Nucleic acid binder design. Structure first.
Lengths: 262, 67, 66, 65, 68, 64, 66, 262, 262, 69, 67, 68, 69, 67, 67
RNA sequence: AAAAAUAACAACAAGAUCCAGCAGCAACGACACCGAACUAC
């Protein structure tokens, strides 16, 4: 049947992903579109055929400072048109957004700054969120549905984090971020993909560098397939495989009944 | 006000070119600038003000979904 | 409002395409999405807000019980 | 504040008098009164139609009551 | 609350003056005020007519009447 | 309150002819012998009780 | 009446030549001299008392804001 | 009083029906617009005076092949505008549609293929219905109202036919046909006329060629007066005068309250 | 764990189900409260220890005639209080309602008339629905979470019935019933338990007597577990085992993480 | 130079009495046979002949297949 | 002259047939024609106006006319 | 051309007649024509408008301007 | 009049028979190959002889990339 | 032609007047005219946009500036 | 075309991601591949011809300096 | 001036700056208003 598999992943640097073997695993997994957040490389660097897969196209938006950020995106068929922009100063400067249009559906490779480095990063993240709320309030009018395959770097509910009592002050889980996520996923109506297909816990996507957290399963859910309410009904399965870890995060394969086409 | 204000404030925040049809059959166009309990304001070049007792209908140009 | 509220609620839940005749003669068509003490919502390709103080009659396209 | 409206309308409705409701815009409605409220009335000339009070002008009963 | 409409209507009723009610629409009705209220007025004719207050524009007595 | 009642009181005490234009478009002539919160009496040739809601505007015949 | 009162007061103080369009269609012209619950005294050479329940809209003519 | 009468009779050959007295029968009876179907001739044949009815304007959209079908209207007052063709291949080729817009309403005249001639006719009927359902889904959004004089050749419910069990194999009563006809009167909203004012059985329009079937009255209701819900309130009365019998289909007369005015 | 299992099984006569072995199957099938409905027997009949199970209490309310209707209810622990009244002639006179109260949780055995028996039954069903919607609208003020074990005899959406194209005319699937059931699950805020965990089709709970529909799985979902929005989050899982069926309906087993108590 | 295709097509649609359908920039879909045409105007027929302006037309779809040599 | 628009407009003006010009915006202008030339077709209804042709979509006379 | 567009415009210009320009989008400009060109028409409202001719639907003078 | 891109681009789209997609100024989409082109009109063969006017066309999105000579 | 448009735009360009251009679709563009040429104007407020003359309806400078 | 041609040529040579707003209001983000008196070919996945008489404005996403 | 009725709160320091776009509405409620009373849209 019409199975559209989207594979979102945060490579945390395309170099590490290529070293660990993300390209081979991704090519093996049948999917219509793959989102790679945080490329940390310029568009010319992605031009190398090493990253170009057979049967997939190469799209990417590079940050002003290559190491600061960058996003990529591959699809099986030539999309209608690529929109490598957002409008805000932060997005345009750090190239944290790239969109691909299709038939009544458009996929966006969103990337909110982690804010785990320092205070300036947390302020940039707060600004980016206070601007993306306006952006989503604007896109709420158009007919075409959107699929933001984005690493929001913010956990929503307790089901996304174990031992929440300890992470009540760690960046990515404070009160304002929780409120913003609850408003974007409730007030605006952008229903999540996981909380509608599998309302279970322990579905973590992030793990600190410390192997102790990995062994203990202490992880956070940062990746998100944000879906317009029009596409919520078109969800089928979404499971996070952690054994093919190729970066700080893990892929988030999601299959939909909707079928894309030029 | 349970359903009146949630609509007018939504139109205001969204800046929808709304058309207001009065009770006497006359049509006005523009965006709601600042609606009140008795009078609404338009965002045209003149910033006309229309009372809420002579307005018959208010149709938006683009479909607005109640939050 | 012993008849207004139940009547409007029955016309809403069943999604009956109602015809609202205003005071100035012109008539609008569409089903009642939601209603208030002073505003009704007509869905007919454009969710418009009609005012209670401007409506003259409301005729359902098909009979409705009470 | 309806010592004169409510009894008249109730009598006209119970007795099933074919009344004609002349509105403000000049239209002449007809049909029997099914049930009246403080701000709306119901007629059934062909279907159950709700007439708003503020839009009604006069109610001529076809038979003297 | 009013103190001038009630006595005027009571006079027009008890004196049985041929009243002419002109509505906001722009028509004319003739008859005597049989009963009044805060929102309706009964007019005598071939068939008693209940005219609403909000629709009445002017009430002219065929003859001048004095206030009580 | 602070305008309607004093204005009508001035119109009455002066016995000035007052033209009451109704919302229907008719121009009623006469003086305001008295006024209420819902009806205004306009007597000059024949007694009249013009309801407030049916009054669009009220213009004096001379400065007041 | 949170914005109606200050708006009318600003139109009055500045002596703005507003244009009041009634519900019946006829339009009146003249600066706002004063206003109160269900009444507006339009004074421009000649004084008039326009009832608010009969006024449909008030075009300020000049770009004037609160 | 205010009333608008409309006649819909599938003549299956205007020549035969006229020789039997259709023209005189209609001229004698009061009527506003005669929306007959299946002319079996060309527009020129209709233009002839022998076909025209005094006091009724005549329009027609003939088929590619005369005998294959054709539709013609008889209006009493010059309509606002006449539209020929529906957009489909089978519609525009075989002249199975003709509309006459009025001030508000716009009487049409639809003629579906029989289907009993062979499997190819049944496939053509299925295709035309699959296209007409989409046409109606697109048409139900416009403001003005319509009054289709369609000869759907398909029964709606069991009550519309006696001994529905044996008809399970004959065309015009198959499962997909019933499904389509019920969906056109279901979600789309297009109400009916005959079964809207008098919901009593034993009323049919079509009858087999065998006179015995007529004596036993084993007929099907193929002539429909589909009308948008906006007009369902104005329907006043309907009749199926089978006494004259001018063809294999019985005349379907109706009268509404809406007063046409050019 | 704090699991709570509820079984709703319509028997269409407790005699047939007991003969097929419903008593032993229930005594073996672990659960807390069995919402079995359509007893068709008087209280003096249910009092027979043959029906009374071990470790489960018995409550029953019958109409004036034992076969006219009646509904029963089992429970693990003695409920806080049981009530056999709703306040409607269509409910008390038929014994179609019985509610049991535990700590801030009330379980009700609702039974709507089938309606397929005739037109009078359909009218009674419509009256009962029009009164029950008002009862619910009145009950929205209470804070207790309600668990209505309803045999509504109404399918909500397309997935709830196979071959809906043909069922759009048969009772139990008409337009007003669908609108009422959607309003219950719509404006009123209530939500079905089964449709919450399993958003897949083919999960039916009724089939006609003809084994053809059973072989083809052509069935409806005439069994619901209506839950107050307060209990919507506690829905762990739901199941509709068809093989161990003891009547036209199939046992509907819903398990929650809620832990009832005396 | 500028009518090498626009004039023959309309002439063929007119001579053969083809019931064409015109589309205005406003989105309306006018129907009726073409009676005449020029450099900036087209005369429809149908029930009452009305004028249409070229600068307001978007697409002229022929209901029946047209053959223009 | 050497066209179809000019004779048609001349006939419309001479016979004074009530035409209902429809603009590209979709609105109509009820009123007869008084004089035309280029980029203009003066209408004389209740208040004289000046259409610009390029903003006209169709000119529909209320009675059949033959050039 | 412009045999008629000039008289009816230069007249309103020299006479200073308040004109109402209806555009193609629906908005209505008001004021006197200060000076008009083959491609643009300057209005004399509170602020020099400069309304283009290719975006004007109609020009209706509120005064019955003569047609010289 | 000496169009350096319009004329050759349309000629190449026609010769190769690319599923051109014309988006009109009104905002509606028309799909179908390009049969012929002119200075003021374009005939696209979408199973009919539809003629779309130039001034009413906003963009001409091709389906597959074409080689511009 | 265009004997009045060029001198009217030259004044606005030399005086650096903030103009609020109105597009045909109703959207407004606020900014000063940086340059102008046949069928093109340059508006630099938030970004140097190039507005086509055929898409402009009105050019309100919000200031009495006349050569 | 004293300024339109240099502007478009600079935008093409610099390959700045421009955004063309049309008269209908739709946006089209792309790069100028080749322009002419009536067309401005884009460059976004493929070459998309855009007519001059339909463009409302061209917004260079990056500041540009005239020649 | 009164919830035809909360199977019941371990308890209220206390109420009178532009839609990557619909195979397209026989046409927009006929355009933003164009100052002595006469009873079907």
């Amino acid at each position: 049947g019409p199975a559209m598999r989207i594979i979102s992943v945060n490579v945390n640097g395309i170099q590490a992903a290529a070293e660990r073997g993300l390209l081979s695993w991704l090519q093996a997994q049948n999917a219509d579109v793959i989102c790679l957040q945080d490329t940390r490389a310029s568009a010319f660097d992605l031009d190398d055929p090493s990253f170009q897969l057979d049967g997939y196209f190469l799209y990417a938006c590079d940050a002003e400072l290559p190491e600061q950020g960058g996003v990529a995106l591959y699809s099986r068929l030539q999309p209608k048109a690529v929109i490598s922009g957002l409008g805000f100063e932060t997005a345009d400067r750090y190239g944290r957004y790239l969109q691909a249009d299709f038939d009544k559906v458009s996929i966006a490779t969103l990337l909110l700054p982690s804010g785990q480095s320092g205070d300036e990063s947390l302020n940039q993240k707060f600004k980016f969120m206070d601007d993306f709320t306006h952006y989503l309030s604007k896109q709420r009018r158009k007919r075409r549905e959107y699929i933001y395959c984005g690493s929001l770097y913010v956990a929503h509910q307790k089901m996304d984090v174990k031992n929440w009592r300890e992470c009540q002050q760690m960046p990515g889980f404070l009160a304002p971020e929780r409120a913003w996520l609850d408003e974007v996923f409730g007030n605006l109506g952008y229903a999540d993909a996981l909380r509608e297909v599998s309302r279970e816990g322990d579905q973590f996507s992030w793990w600190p560098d410390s192997e102790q957290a990995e062994m203990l399963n202490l992880g956070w859910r940062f990746d998100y397939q944000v879906l317009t309410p029009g596409l919520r009904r078109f969800v089928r399965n979404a499971k996070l495989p952690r054994q093919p870890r190729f970066s700080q995060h893990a892929p988030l394969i999601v299959d939909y009944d909707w079928q894309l086409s030029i | 006000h349970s359903l009146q204000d949630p609509y007018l404030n939504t139109l205001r925040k969204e800046r929808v070119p709304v058309s207001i049809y009065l009770v006497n059959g006359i049509k006005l166009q523009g965006q709601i600038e600042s609606f009140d309990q008795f009078v609404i304001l338009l965002k045209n070049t003149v910033s006309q003000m229309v009372y809420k007792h002579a307005i018959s209908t208010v149709v938006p140009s683009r479909p607005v979904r109640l939050p």
